[PDB]
Amino acid sequence: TTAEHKQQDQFYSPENQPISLHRNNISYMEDVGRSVKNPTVPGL
Amino acid sequence: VYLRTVATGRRYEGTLFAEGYDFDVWVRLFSLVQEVRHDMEKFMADHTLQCVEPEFECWEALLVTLRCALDFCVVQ
Amino acid sequence: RMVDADFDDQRPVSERRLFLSLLTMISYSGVLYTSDLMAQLMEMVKYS
Amino acid sequence: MREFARFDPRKSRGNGQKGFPFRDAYLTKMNEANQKTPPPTLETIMDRAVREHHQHARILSPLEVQRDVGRLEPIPSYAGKINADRSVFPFQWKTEDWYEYEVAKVRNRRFVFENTE
Amino acid sequence: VSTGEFDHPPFQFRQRHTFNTTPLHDANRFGGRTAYLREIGPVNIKKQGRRFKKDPRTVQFNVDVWCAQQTLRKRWKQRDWEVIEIPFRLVPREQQRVIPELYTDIPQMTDPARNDFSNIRNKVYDREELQGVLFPAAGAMLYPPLQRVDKQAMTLDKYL
Amino acid sequence: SLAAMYMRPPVTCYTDACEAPVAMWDGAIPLKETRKLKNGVPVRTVSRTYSHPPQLTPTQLSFNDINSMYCVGNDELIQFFPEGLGGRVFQTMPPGHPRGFLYRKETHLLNLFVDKVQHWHTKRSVLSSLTNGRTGFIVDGPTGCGKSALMCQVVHFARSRNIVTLYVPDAKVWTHGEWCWPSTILPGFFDAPDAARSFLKYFAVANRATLTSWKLRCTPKDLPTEQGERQPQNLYELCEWGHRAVAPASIDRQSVCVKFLMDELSEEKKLPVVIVVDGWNLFSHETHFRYPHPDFLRGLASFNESSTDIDLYPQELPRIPASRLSFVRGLNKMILSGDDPNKFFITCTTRDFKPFDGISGFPNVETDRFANSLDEYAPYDPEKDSHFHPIQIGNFDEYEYRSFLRFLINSGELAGLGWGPLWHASSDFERKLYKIGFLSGRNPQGVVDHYHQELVWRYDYQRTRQKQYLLKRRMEGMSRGA
Amino acid sequence: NTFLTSSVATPPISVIRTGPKWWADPERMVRQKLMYFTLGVDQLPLRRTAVIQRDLQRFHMCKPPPRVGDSTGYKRSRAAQLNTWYRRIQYQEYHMQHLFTRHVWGLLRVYPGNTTKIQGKADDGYVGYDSVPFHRYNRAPLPFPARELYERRK
Amino acid sequence: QLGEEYWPSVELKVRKPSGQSKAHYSLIDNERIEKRSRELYEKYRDAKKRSLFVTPMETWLEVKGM
Amino acid sequence: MQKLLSPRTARHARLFRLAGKLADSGSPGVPKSDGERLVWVNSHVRRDKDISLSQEEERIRELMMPLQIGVRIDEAEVDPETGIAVGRGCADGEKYHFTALLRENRDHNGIITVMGKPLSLVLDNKAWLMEMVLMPFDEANLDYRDFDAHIVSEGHAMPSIANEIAAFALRMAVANALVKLIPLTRIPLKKSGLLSVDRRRERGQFPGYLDGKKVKRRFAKR
Amino acid sequence: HRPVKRLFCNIGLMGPQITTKARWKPYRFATNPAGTSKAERMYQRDKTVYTHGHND
Amino acid sequence: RRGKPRPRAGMFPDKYRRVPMLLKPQQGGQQYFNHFLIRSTNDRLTQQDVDN
Amino acid sequence: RLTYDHLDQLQQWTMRATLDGRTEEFNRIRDLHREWSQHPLMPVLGDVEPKFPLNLFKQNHRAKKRFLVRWHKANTPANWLWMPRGPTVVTPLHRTNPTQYPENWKQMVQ
RNA sequence: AAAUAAGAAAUUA
Numbered sequence A: 001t002t003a004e005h006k007q008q009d010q011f012y013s014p015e016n017q018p019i020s021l022h023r024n025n026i027s028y029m030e031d032v033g034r035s036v037k038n039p040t041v042p043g044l
Numbered sequence B: 001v002y003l004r005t006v007a008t009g010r011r012y013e014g015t016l017f018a019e020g021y022d023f024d025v026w027v028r029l030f031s032l033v034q035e036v037r038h039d040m041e042k043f044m045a046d047h048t049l050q051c052v053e054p055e056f057e058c059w060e061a062l063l064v065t066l067r068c069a070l071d072f073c074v075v076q
Numbered sequence C: 001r002m003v004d005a006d007f008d009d010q011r012p013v014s015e016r017r018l019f020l021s022l023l024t025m026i027s028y029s030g031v032l033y034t035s036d037l038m039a040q041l042m043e044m045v046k047y048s
Numbered sequence D: 001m002r003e004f005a006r007f008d009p010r011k012s013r014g015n016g017q018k019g020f021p022f023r024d025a026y027l028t029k030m031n032e033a034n035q036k037t038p039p040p041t042l043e044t045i046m047d048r049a050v051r052e053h054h055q056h057a058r059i060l061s062p063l064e065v066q067r068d069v070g071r072l073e074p075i076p077s078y079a080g081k082i083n084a085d086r087s088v089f090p091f092q093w094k095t096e097d098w099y100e101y102e103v104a105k106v107r108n109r110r111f112v113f114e115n116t117e
Numbered sequence E: 001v002s003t004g005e006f007d008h009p010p011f012q013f014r015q016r017h018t019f020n021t022t023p024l025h026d027a028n029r030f031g032g033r034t035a036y037l038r039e040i041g042p043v044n045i046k047k048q049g050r051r052f053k054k055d056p057r058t059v060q061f062n063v064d065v066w067c068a069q070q071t072l073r074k075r076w077k078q079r080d081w082e083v084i085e086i087p088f089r090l091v092p093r094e095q096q097r098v099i100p101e102l103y104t105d106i107p108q109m110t111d112p113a114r115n116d117f118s119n120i121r122n123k124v125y126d127r128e129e130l131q132g133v134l135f136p137a138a139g140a141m142l143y144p145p146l147q148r149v150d151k152q153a154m155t156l157d158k159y160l
Numbered sequence F: 001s002l003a004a005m006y007m008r009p010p011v012t013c014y015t016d017a018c019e020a021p022v023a024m025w026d027g028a029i030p031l032k033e034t035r036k037l038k039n040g041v042p043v044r045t046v047s048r049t050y051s052h053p054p055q056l057t058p059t060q061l062s063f064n065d066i067n068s069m070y071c072v073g074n075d076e077l078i079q080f081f082p083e084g085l086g087g088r089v090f091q092t093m094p095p096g097h098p099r100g101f102l103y104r105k106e107t108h109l110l111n112l113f114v115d116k117v118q119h120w121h122t123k124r125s126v127l128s129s130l131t132n133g134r135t136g137f138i139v140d141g142p143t144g145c146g147k148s149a150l151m152c153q154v155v156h157f158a159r160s161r162n163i164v165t166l167y168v169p170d171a172k173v174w175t176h177g178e179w180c181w182p183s184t185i186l187p188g189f190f191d192a193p194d195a196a197r198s199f200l201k202y203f204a205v206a207n208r209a210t211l212t213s214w215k216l217r218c219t220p221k222d223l224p225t226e227q228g229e230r231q232p233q234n235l236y237e238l239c240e241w242g243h244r245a246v247a248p249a250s251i252d253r254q255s256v257c258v259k260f261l262m263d264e265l266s267e268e269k270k271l272p273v274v275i276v277v278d279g280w281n282l283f284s285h286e287t288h289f290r291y292p293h294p295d296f297l298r299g300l301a302s303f304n305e306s307s308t309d310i311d312l313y314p315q316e317l318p319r320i321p322a323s324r325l326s327f328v329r330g331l332n333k334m335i336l337s338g339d340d341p342n343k344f345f346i347t348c349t350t351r352d353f354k355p356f357d358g359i360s361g362f363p364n365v366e367t368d369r370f371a372n373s374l375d376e377y378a379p380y381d382p383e384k385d386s387h388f389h390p391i392q393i394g395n396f397d398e399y400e401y402r403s404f405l406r407f408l409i410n411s412g413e414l415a416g417l418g419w420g421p422l423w424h425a426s427s428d429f430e431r432k433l434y435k436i437g438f439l440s441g442r443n444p445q446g447v448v449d450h451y452h453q454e455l456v457w458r459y460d461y462q463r464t465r466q467k468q469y470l471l472k473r474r475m476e477g478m479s480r481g482a
Numbered sequence G: 001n002t003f004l005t006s007s008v009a010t011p012p013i014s015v016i017r018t019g020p021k022w023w024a025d026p027e028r029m030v031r032q033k034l035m036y037f038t039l040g041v042d043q044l045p046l047r048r049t050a051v052i053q054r055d056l057q058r059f060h061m062c063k064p065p066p067r068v069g070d071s072t073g074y075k076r077s078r079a080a081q082l083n084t085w086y087r088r089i090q091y092q093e094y095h096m097q098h099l100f101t102r103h104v105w106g107l108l109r110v111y112p113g114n115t116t117k118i119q120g121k122a123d124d125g126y127v128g129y130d131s132v133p134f135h136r137y138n139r140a141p142l143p144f145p146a147r148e149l150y151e152r153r154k
Numbered sequence H: 001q002l003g004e005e006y007w008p009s010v011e012l013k014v015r016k017p018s019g020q021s022k023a024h025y026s027l028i029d030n031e032r033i034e035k036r037s038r039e040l041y042e043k044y045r046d047a048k049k050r051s052l053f054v055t056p057m058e059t060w061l062e063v064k065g066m
Numbered sequence I: 001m002q003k004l005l006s007p008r009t010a011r012h013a014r015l016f017r018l019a020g021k022l023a024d025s026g027s028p029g030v031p032k033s034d035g036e037r038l039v040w041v042n043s044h045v046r047r048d049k050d051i052s053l054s055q056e057e058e059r060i061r062e063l064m065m066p067l068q069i070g071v072r073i074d075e076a077e078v079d080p081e082t083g084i085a086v087g088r089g090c091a092d093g094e095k096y097h098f099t100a101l102l103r104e105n106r107d108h109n110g111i112i113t114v115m116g117k118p119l120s121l122v123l124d125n126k127a128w129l130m131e132m133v134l135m136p137f138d139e140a141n142l143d144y145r146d147f148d149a150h151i152v153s154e155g156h157a158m159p160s161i162a163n164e165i166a167a168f169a170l171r172m173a174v175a176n177a178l179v180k181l182i183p184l185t186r187i188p189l190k191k192s193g194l195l196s197v198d199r200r201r202e203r204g205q206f207p208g209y210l211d212g213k214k215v216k217r218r219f220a221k222r
Numbered sequence J: 001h002r003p004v005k006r007l008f009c010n011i012g013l014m015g016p017q018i019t020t021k022a023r024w025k026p027y028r029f030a031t032n033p034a035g036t037s038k039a040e041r042m043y044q045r046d047k048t049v050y051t052h053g054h055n056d
Numbered sequence K: 001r002r003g004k005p006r007p008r009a010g011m012f013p014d015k016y017r018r019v020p021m022l023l024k025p026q027q028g029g030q031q032y033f034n035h036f037l038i039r040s041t042n043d044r045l046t047q048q049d050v051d052n
Numbered sequence L: 001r002l003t004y005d006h007l008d009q010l011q012q013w014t015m016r017a018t019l020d021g022r023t024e025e026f027n028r029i030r031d032l033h034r035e036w037s038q039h040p041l042m043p044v045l046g047d048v049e050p051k052f053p054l055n056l057f058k059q060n061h062r063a064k065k066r067f068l069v070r071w072h073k074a075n076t077p078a079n080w081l082w083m084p085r086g087p088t089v090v091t092p093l094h095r096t097n098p099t100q101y102p103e104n105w106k107q108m109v110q
Numbered sequence M: 001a002a003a004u005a006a007g008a009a010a011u012u013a
């Protein structure tokens, strides 16, 4: 490829390989079981 | 180092000295150390114009040999 | 290079095996040995 | 920086704030703990040594590195040359002296002999 | 380069003791000085208060006096020395000059030619080197002379 | 993931027991399959890449070990340090954790020195030349380099070799104390009664072996005693007599007892004695106590007219110099008098003072790292201010620093105290090492501190871009399979 | 503990909603971690929290991903489920902090702020020197001087 | 120019005595103080037969009552 | 028993010889004594064995992981004598103006200093502030230790600048200096948005609002 | 409470601690008459008298 | 505001309107780009040896 | 408010406890931690915390907060069912009892 | 009372 491409285009950008461009992504994942349906007591 | 590996039965990697030697061995060993130190100093005194020094390995080897001699003497 | 670096393989070769292989390869070429090469080689041996 | 290189305290008399040496450089000099500049740490000197004697490739200072993939540029004349004295730079200084300096420089604005031979 | 608080918080809706918030004149601010500024209780505006205690400019002035005390105090705890007035003759070679008063000239280097650059102002002298000068009457030295370290001596740090 | 294949390498030490369940440290400290030869070409054995530093007796530490890390067993820790440890030293040693020490080159120096002290009478010339005639050393440096730790280590070396050792783990317990009594039988001197009592206690239990053999050459044989109690015949017995009493009696007893203890120490000329004081520089100037205003001494009728201000205004009276503390008096007496070449002071400095830069506000009480620091703000020069030979200590060089950080992180993770199952959130070792270097300046206390703070780094992008690349590679693999 | 006075309790969710400003302020989180580490106990919930929040902060100026309309509402419900997970991961932490802090204060002979429980020592809320002369929630009269939770020697 | 009496003085910052000097503060009057502390020990031994706690004010400290 | 001091492996031997040779050329900072040289060599070998360990732990970790003009390249603006380059940072349009003087350290001990004080002290040891000042050296793939920096505060002075906004301005100053010094380094920097300036300000004071800034006064229906 | 705190400063054998480590009761509590048992006492003092809480 | 309902969030100008697009989010980690490029390239060659 | 002051007092307590060989409070602390630090379970779809109904009060009204508080008041951590505490719970990340911690190490020896 | 150097994210006419 053109030396120009490898000088200017070889960095991470919203074009090339962006880190997530959006709010509210999945930060933390783990392998866990499901909780019971409606574990919260309705109250007061 | 040769002398050292006689005196300590081991290499770089209760024993304070090599075991099972006769007493005459240790006498001759001491003689040998004195001899090495001797020729060391001759060779040094000769070439002194162009400075010559006794590399660390050598010096420390002599010392550890003689220490082994010492501990032989005190166990005996 | 065989001395100081530590080799990363999926089946690591013994120091002695690698040493011998090199030695063999330098003996099969009819090369005249330089003093430095022999010196380095036998420092390999001394500490093995 | 140029003013400070040619600075002499005897010339400062009769000038106002123009007579004051460049703050940072002067205060750095006035500092004694700066005067002792550390040697290039053992790991560093070893690393460089190994690369240029054992491995046959010197370590290039970041300015001598060629960073254009498409060009080869002449290495700047200051590249490995300028040496490191904490007495010179980076500017590091005692707080007492800084206070005194700043205040002096304000109080002296009007002590200027204009008319001089 | 201090991290401490030098500004009194601005008056607002009443602050209460919360995560992340404390009362304005709470005992934990300004080392408990806020006592001086405090009108305790549900203050009845019409009938009661002490006006100066809610005033921004006045309050801030008080706080500033307190900060000044703190600094002064710490600058004096920082001294180990007295100023003695010694006649020109008997003083060390470095002070035999003229020494401009404070904030008058450029902060001044003690001895550039001998490689000492430091404020002459803040140079401190040992009571033991000035002994002959300060207590001539006494005959025998009152303080025994400083013992100094040979920096050429082979000691534990030289690896011998 | 070779987890369920993992067995545990059977326990010889306190240290080997410090390992948590595999599930906790698995990704954080990676497993590997090692194929050796027994009865079949392999039998797969799963080992961990990292293991806690060895647990080494002071006698086993050699020249070859400098800049490495070694561990101290928990019970050795109990044996050798009933006083405590140096100021912050224990912050690296929570209950589950292994107890590490970086063996520095100065550590090796003092280890050699102590090992000679053991039989000093033979080595007298060697020793005296090693300190250049002074009585021992004072170690000085910036805040938060190895000082208090180095002192800890010296206590370890000394007490493992069975030498009688005073250890004052923090000098501030004396000079900046709870309170200050005038000493009972020494006119014009003072005590720190709480410091003194706790000292008399731990000193006794640390040296009890040797101190029970010690016979008293000068102490009165008449000491006041309650019914059913015994006249001390040992130095140990004496120290016991000092601190075991109901208060207030403890208070006067401790005065008498400290005076006689030091009088006994100075009278022993053949048995090596190592005195380790952390923060000597606190003993060489004034304590923070001030002489009582003389009107407390004269008795009073009314405040109305006595010509007395004590109730009206506070005022400062001259500080009590530490040399007028009865304990410090004892020590100074041993330093300054010649004809005591029995005693070795290996001593330390503390720069733990509150920060002051030319303005001070008021410290926020929620966020204050310095609340337990001293108020000092006055300079200390070990050359002019002590009779000891000064030794200087710097920050870690990179060789020390690396070994230390590797320990803090990996042996932390092995003990279940670190990222654990979350290991993929923090960056790799090299990056952490480099960055923590930049932040800390390699100052040891700074390294400890920033190692903890690493939890909060915002701007580290490594695992992000790595994760991204691993993903891309997996999806190309899945497109090639298809 | 220096802050002794009666206080106002805020529901956990509003405390968490402060994000970087308080709940996740780096400074605060670090000395929580210090407390745990010193007690010789892993700080997992703190680390989960720090992870979630770290990332919250990183993307906090971006717009949310574009929503395509669905009769299912699977997207909306999955976003919600993830969100309440994170909320709960942090409730657990918030609980841990209050828990351990109260326990540690019990070991250090510390007196808590007014009307605060310390499990082994003060079961009903501890109070002394309140602006109001009775214990607020018991409605029982307070003794003078302030009640002591610990035996005298120090 | 009238003579030295009018040459203004120099103001030196003279340090307090050093750590090294201050060390001797604990040896000031050493003999007298040891010899005395033995007598004080007698006074203490005796006083401690009567009362549980012996104050310095029963031994070497003077406090004027009236 | 005893341990030997003399070099154990062939590796140690080789490095030990190197250190000797360096000592004979009298290069700065090299140990004159043989004991020091030994300590040095042992320590070095141990460091390299560590590096190999971290690389292995990485390879293993990698498997168990969970999941048109471009940019303006300029010439270098540097003082030919002092070898210094000068950038400026801003935040809040007024409050924070910084100027970084950046110069290359050939001894490899670099340091950053702000208004005459070490960076640690100035930012109050808070890591999440100081790493912002580290970032430009990262993005540019540089070793921060090859550079000396001094930052100068040209804005509103305050006793403590440790806070994230001030740090943003700092990071920017450093990055602009770095770009004047190593021109090509501009392209990574610009893409990671270091050189980019955000324009934000506290609202101007104004007596209409209660707090002086954002809060309108109480309203009642007539 | 005022002269007590001052006397403690002048006894000097505590020295810097009085303001820094030591805690004192708040103003209105410290003003209670000796013998005070219940907190209610603060509110049981006479309101017919203009002492500014300096009355029993 | 005054006795009237608050505007919906979308009726205010953008909260970050004054922050440049290169800042939201920051693309940091540029240092690693080249690295992974080489890596991937290298891997491709590895994956030929298996096949061929 | 947990303060650096408290952290130092904590360190000293922890140390003094280690040296007197008191293992008990460490064990209570370990227990507490083991109980309440377990990983909370991913909620089922359809499960969310209730918001306050619009068109009930005006947006500036107290009722809003009064609801939130009264909700969180009713869900006490003893009512949190999404975190798995109990004797029934298997805890892979943690050590089960006193006998598995390092100060017991002598019994772990063969 | 507030989406403005702060940190809030999904039920238009």
Ligand SMILES: Nc1nc2c(ncn2[C@@H]2O[C@H](COP(=O)(O)OP(=O)(O)OP(=O)(O)O)[C@@H](O)[C@H]2O)c(=O)[nH]1
Residues within 6 Å of the ligand: F086, F087, F088, F089, F090, F091, F092, F100, F101, F102, F103, F104, F141, F142, F143, F144, F145, F146, F147, F148, F149, F150, F349, F350, F351, F352, F444, F445, F448
């Ligand atoms: N294992 C080990 N840890 C060390 C060593 N040096 C420092 N540390 C750690 O780093 C911290 C440095 O703190 P101190 O050693 O107490 O610092 P200091 O020199 O006494 O400084 P000041 O008391 O503040 O004058 C210690 O608490 C140790 O945890 C060391 O040589 N070996």
Ligand SMILES: [Mg+2]
Residues within 6 Å of the ligand: F086, F087, F088, F147, F148, F349, F350, F351, F352
């Ligand atoms: Mg210390």
